[PDB]
Amino acid sequence: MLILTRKVGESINIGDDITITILGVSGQQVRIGINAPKDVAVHREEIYQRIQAGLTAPD
């Protein structure tokens, strides 16, 4: 893992083709954004487990 801190309204980068932006907070909830090509995919870690089961194109 690589851990660090950010402030609401700022960003982070990954894989030189992906970007992340902490849009703001709401208590224990945090609104966040992601920016990547459709050449890759993004989901909550639960929704991901419904996909990595053997596919990349659900119903």
Partner RNA sequence: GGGUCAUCAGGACGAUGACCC
Q: What does 53 interact with, of a second copy, RNA, none (CB < 5 to 8 A by kind)?
A: none
- Whichever of 2 and 55 has its CB closer to RNA, that residue is 2
50 binds, among RNA, a second copy, none (CB under 5 to 8 A by kind): none
CA distances from 37 to 2, 20, 22, 29, 34 (A): 22, 13, 19, 26, 10
Closer residue to RNA, CB minimum distance, 27 or 54: 27
Beta bridge partners of 37: none
In the bound complex, what is the minimum distance in angstroms from residue 59's beta carbon to a second copy?
16
The residue among 26, 33, 37 whose CA lies nearest residue 9 is 33
